[PDB]
Amino acid sequence: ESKVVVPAQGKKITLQNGKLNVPENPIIPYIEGDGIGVDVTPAMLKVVDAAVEKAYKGERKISWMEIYTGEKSTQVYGQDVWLPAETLDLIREYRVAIKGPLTTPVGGGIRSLNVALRQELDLYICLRPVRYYQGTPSPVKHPELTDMVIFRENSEDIYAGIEWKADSADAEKVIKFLREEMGVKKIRFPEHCGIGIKPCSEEGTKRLVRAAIEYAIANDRDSVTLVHKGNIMKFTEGAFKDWGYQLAREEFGGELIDGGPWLKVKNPNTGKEIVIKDVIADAFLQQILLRPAEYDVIACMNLNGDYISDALAAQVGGIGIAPGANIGDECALFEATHGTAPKYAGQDKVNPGSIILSAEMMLRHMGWTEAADLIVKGMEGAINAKTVTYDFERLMDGAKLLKCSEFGDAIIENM
Amino acid sequence: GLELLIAQTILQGFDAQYGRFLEVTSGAQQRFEQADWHAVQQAMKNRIHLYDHHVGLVVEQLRCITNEFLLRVKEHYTRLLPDYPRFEIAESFFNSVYCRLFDHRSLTPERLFIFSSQPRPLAKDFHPDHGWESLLMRVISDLPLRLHWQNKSRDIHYIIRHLTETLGPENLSKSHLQVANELFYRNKAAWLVGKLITPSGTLPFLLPIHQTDDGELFIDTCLTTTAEASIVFGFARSYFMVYAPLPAALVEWLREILPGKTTAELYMAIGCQKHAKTESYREYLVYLQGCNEQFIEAPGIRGMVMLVFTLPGFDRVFKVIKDKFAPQKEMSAAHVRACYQLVKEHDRVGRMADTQEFENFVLEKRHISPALMELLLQEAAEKITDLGEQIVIRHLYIERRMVPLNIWLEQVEGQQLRDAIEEYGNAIRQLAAANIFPGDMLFKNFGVTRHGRVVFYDYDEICYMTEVNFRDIPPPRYPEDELASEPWYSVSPGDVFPEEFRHWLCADPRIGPLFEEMHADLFRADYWRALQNRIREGHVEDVYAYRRRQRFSV
Ligand SMILES: Nc1ncnc2c1ncn2[C@@H]1O[C@H](COP(=O)(O)OP(=O)(O)OP(=O)(O)O)[C@@H](O)[C@H]1O
Numbered sequence: 030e031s032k033v034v035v036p037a038q039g040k041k042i043t044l045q046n047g048k049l050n051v052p053e054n055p056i057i058p059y060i061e062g063d064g065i066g067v068d069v070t071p072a073m074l075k076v077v078d079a080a081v082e083k084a085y086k087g088e089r090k091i092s093w094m095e096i097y098t099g100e101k102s103t104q105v106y107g108q109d110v111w112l113p114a115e116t117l118d119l120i121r122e123y124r125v126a127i128k129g130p131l132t133t134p135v136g137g138g139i140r141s142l143n144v145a146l147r148q149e150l151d152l153y154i155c156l157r158p159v160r161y162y163q164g165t166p167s168p169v170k171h172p173e174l175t176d177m178v179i180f181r182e183n184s185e186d187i188y189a190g191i192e193w194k195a196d197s198a199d200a201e202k203v204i205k206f207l208r209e210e211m212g213v214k215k216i217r218f219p220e221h222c223g224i225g226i227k228p229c230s231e232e233g234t235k236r237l238v239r240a241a242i243e244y245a246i247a248n249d250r251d252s253v254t255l256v257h258k259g260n261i262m263k264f265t266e267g268a269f270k271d272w273g274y275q276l277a278r279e280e281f282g283g284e285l286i287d288g289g290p291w292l293k294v295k296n297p298n299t300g301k302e303i304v305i306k307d308v309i310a311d312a313f314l315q316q317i318l319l320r321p322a323e324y325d326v327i328a329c330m331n332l333n334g335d336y337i338s339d340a341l342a343a344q345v346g347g348i349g350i351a352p353g354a355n356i357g358d359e360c361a362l363f364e365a366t367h368g369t370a371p372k373y374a375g376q377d378k379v380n381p382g383s384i385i386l387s388a389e390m391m392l393r394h395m396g397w398t399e400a401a402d403l404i405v406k407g408m409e410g411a412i413n414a415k416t417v418t419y420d421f422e423r424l425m426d427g428a429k430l431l432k433c434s435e436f437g438d439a440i441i442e443n444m
Numbered sequence: 445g446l447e448l449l450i451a452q453t454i455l456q457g458f459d460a461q462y463g464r465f466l467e468v469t470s471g472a473q474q475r476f477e478q479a480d481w482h483a484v485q486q487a488m489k490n491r492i493h494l495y496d497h498h499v500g501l502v503v504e505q506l507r508c509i510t511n512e513f514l515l516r517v518k519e520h521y522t523r524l525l526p527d528y529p530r531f532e533i534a535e536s537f538f539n540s541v542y543c544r545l546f547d548h549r550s551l552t553p554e555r556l557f558i559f560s561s562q563p564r565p566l567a568k569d570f571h572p573d574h575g576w577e578s579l580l581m582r583v584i585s586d587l588p589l590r591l592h593w594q595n596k597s598r599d600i601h602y603i604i605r606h607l608t609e610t611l612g613p614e615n616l617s618k619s620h621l622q623v624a625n626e627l628f629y630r631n632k633a634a635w636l637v638g639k640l641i642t643p644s645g646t647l648p649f650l651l652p653i654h655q656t657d658d659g660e661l662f663i664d665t666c667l668t669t670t671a672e673a674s675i676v677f678g679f680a681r682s683y684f685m686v687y688a689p690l691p692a693a694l695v696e697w698l699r700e701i702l703p704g705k706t707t708a709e710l711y712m713a714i715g716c717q718k719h720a721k722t723e724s725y726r727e728y729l730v731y732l733q734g735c736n737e738q739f740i741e742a743p744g745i746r747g748m749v750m751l752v753f754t755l756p757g758f759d760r761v762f763k764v765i766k767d768k769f770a771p772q773k774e775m776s777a778a779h780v781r782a783c784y785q786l787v788k789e790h791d792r793v794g795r796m797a798d799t800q801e802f803e804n805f806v807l808e809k810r811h812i813s814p815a816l817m818e819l820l821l822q823e824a825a826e827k828i829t830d831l832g833e834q835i836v837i838r839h840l841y842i843e844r845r846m847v848p849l850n851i852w853l854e855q856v857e858g859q860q861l862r863d864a865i866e867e868y869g870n871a872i873r874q875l876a877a878a879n880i881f882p883g884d885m886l887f888k889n890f891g892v893t894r895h896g897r898v899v900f901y902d903y904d905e906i907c908y909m910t911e912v913n914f915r916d917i918p919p920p921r922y923p924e925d926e927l928a929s930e931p932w933y934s935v936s937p938g939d940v941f942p943e944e945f946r947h948w949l950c951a952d953p954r955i956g957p958l959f960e961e962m963h964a965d966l967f968r969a970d971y972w973r974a975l976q977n978r979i980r981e982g983h984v985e986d987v988y989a990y991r992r993r994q995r996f997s998v
Pocket residue numbers: 742743744745746747748749750751752761797843844845846847848884888889891901902903904
């Protein structure tokens with residue numbers, strides 16, 4: 030059976046009472062990932078270990094345990110075993126894990142492994158922290174003022190995929206029901222008409238806002254901003270705002286600011302105030318270009334979170350070095366967010382920025398905020414110095430070209 | 445007084461149906477002569493769907509006549525079966541009527557013919573009295589085919605060259621030939637089927653007659669090995685169009701060749717699929733009585749749409765359609781059945797597995813592994829009902845059990861591995877040329893036969909080659925694109941990208957290079973475009989049920 034060796038001297042991360050007990054000797058599972066995962070994963074392990082050794086003197090150490098998924102999983106488990114049932118089980122059990130890229134499918138017929146892991150492990154939160162790194166090439170004038178954390182709902186909205194083709198009977202049947210049974214007067218063209226359904230629910234909404242407010246508490250963020258299209262879609266996007274504001278009142282004891290919806294929520298640990306605010310989506314996308322500093326932690330629906338994260342990454346020049354995570358009721362999975370770039374795999378050439386920064390997400394999620402900072406210091410140190418991998422080197426001037434492993438060393442040398 | 449009427453009404457149905465079956469089969473020569481390959485394809489579909497029209501007709505008749513009992517009829521029907529030449533199929537025909545009348549319920553021995561309950565020569569001998577040079581001339585001349593031959597003497601020169609290599613010039617003078625009276629028709633081939641009677645024993649003798657483009661008929665090869673005939677009459681190949689006024693006599697005759705095939709399988713090959721099914725159940729019941737065994741989940745990778753089980757030592761799998769598919773498979777139950785219907789009508793080219801729809805199939809509770817009972821009860825609850833000591837699976841398929849290509853590849857070294865991947869590519873090529881797109885080319889969806897040939901069995905994602913848009917993967921616009929997780933280009937349903945096939949087909953370090961030397965075309969969109977262009981131009985790719993090397997031309 031199993032071909033994962035559980036490390037002898039490590040110990041399991043435990044969830045009890047809704048709080049994460051992280052032992053000083055934690056076992057962290059890691060998937061190498063397809064293609065360039067082979068170059069970027071070693072680099073991460075070296076840096077994440079280095080940050081822990083320096084920050085905690087050696088009083089802490091991570092027991093790495095390789096689990097499997099994808100092309101490599103084929104090489105150990107058998108021919109067409111791309112996702113072993115134990116991988117899911119080990120991730121559920123050890124609560125926290127990290128992976129390189131898995132092959133995403135072009136073409137509609139085939140099975141995606143990334144989506145398999147998500148829906149399988151029931152990871153309904155897409156977490157995307159965006160900030161600038163001094164020296165990164167950027168299209169904007171002041172990218173340094175951008176330091177946000179996007180809490181994106183991942184189980185509802187138009188992204189659910191509840192849709193019917195035009196002229197499909199099912200569609201005509203659906204349209205029929207709305208038009209005569211529900212009396213819908215606002216479909217301009219009922220013939221040759223596709224239909225999609227947009228569901229937003231209280232239970233689904235509050236998981237996300239709850240998670241985000243906690244994160245603000247845990248990491249000393251200033252505010253949580255609910256982003257929505259309340260002014261047009263009043264019962265989907267508008268309810269998302271209303272429920273989010275209701276949660277901060279009922280569960281976190283938010284006091285009103287000047288009668289306006291805005292709430293002052295008090296951090297239980299520090300005493301410092303966390304502002305709960307809301308802004309319209311189309312406006313927000315302007316507001317992030319013009320005035321990024323105002324914003325901190327952002328909670329929003331599926332479609333909106335996707336749009337905002339893709340725009341924010343562009344502004345800060347970190348499309349190729351964007352960290353990511355997917356969180357559920359019982360575990361968390363930090364991922365590299367780029368593709369597998371099979372073309373380059375094994376040349377130790379690509380930028381490990383993304384996975385390394387998901388490792389910093391991981392470290393902060395373990396409460397080991399100190400060690401996370403040393404990576405941050407390492408990344409901004411090595412970027413400023415212009416000792417970078419090809420993807421940046423070609424764009425910067427007076428830069429030193431380094432291999433993947435080498436850039437990792439540069440990150441370590443600036444800690 | 446109806447007792448006899450109903451019984452007579454049913455037998456009238458059988459006489460009717462089999463006569464039509466013979467007529468539809470009689471047109472196999474004229475379809476072949478005129479190269480009407482779309483009618484050849486069409487006749488296969490009609491013969492398959494012929495039996496079911498008459499069963500339906502008889503049932504409606506019986507309903508209009510009838511709008512303990514069944515045993516009166518059963519015995520009446522039994523009484524006119526002696527001195528009736530095709531009693532076996534008549535019993536099966538009887539069964540089909542009861543099964544529709546009672547929606548496949550309460551099927552046991554005395555209510556219907558679940559057990560058997562119970563002239564004109566079909567070949568002629570040929571002896572080399574005046575040498576094989578002339579003997580073969582006489583055989584070829586005795587053929588009713590109304591087209592010309594280019595160099596009969598070439599083909600006759602070939603067949604002796606084979607016969608001399610196969611066995612000694614002393615055995616060949618003492619050996620003789622017993623060829624069957626009819627020609628077995630399939631696709632663009634007319635088959636001569638005979639027996640080779642040697643002092644050392646009796647051997648298969650098979651000559652496929654092919655047709656030059658708007659021209660003569662040539663014998664493409666000569667086959668005399670026990671194992672080669674298996675392939676020709678294979679489960680994965682389409683059924684033969686052969687005129688058989690008495691099939692039971694032909695099944696007995698064919699049995700001397702094809703010694704490994706069961707009665708049912710032998711009936712299948714000639715095109716009596718519904719009777720084959722009756723004999724399939726008896727072969728099942730006989731095996732079941734002969735052993736103490738539990739139904740288990742079949743080896744290999746679990747199904748995301750099909751739940752499949754088997755018996756440890758049994759040569760067939762049972763596939764049932766789950767109540768719920770995996771989240772990523774956006775399919776209706778009706779569509780899978782439609783895919784299965786498609787393959788059953790279609791020409792399989794020895795690359796697709798033959799299935800048998802069974803309604804309300806009965807299993808004993810004690811025969812099921814606890815692991816499977818929970819799996820069946822958990823993933824297929826709607827499909828099953830409880831009957832005390834037994835359960836009823838509403839609907840399942842039965843097909844030949846092979847060994848899954850994903851399993852086989854792990855047990856195979858250098859030389860045999862080279863044979864495996866060759867068989868895969870050729871399988872994919874042959875299927876694509878036969879207007880079929882294999883949805884999940886993944887190895888877990890192909891089986892390996894006793895002969896080492898590769899056959900496809902997942903029909904989750906099947907579709908016609910004419911239905912898909914084959915695309916090249918766009919070159920990157922900017923460097924950024926090389927490292928993105930998602931395409932920047934729009935993708936439609938029906939869009940296929942042969943380039944991406946590499947990731948699932950060339951993961952392993954051994955198999956990749958072999959694909960790269962043997963089947964580079966499978967990963968280029970231009971190859972699938974050329975193929976689909978020919979299917980759109982009406983061209984039908986010839987399939988040889990034999991090695992390409994065996995051909996006379998090489
Ligand atoms: N003819 C056969 N011989 C041996 N094993 C078989 C056969 N047919 C099916 N199986 C086994 O049953 C499994 C599931 O059946 P099948 O692959 O036909 O459909 P599926 O699994 O629903 O499709 P998918 O590959 O998309 O999940 C196979 O992976 C294999 O292990």
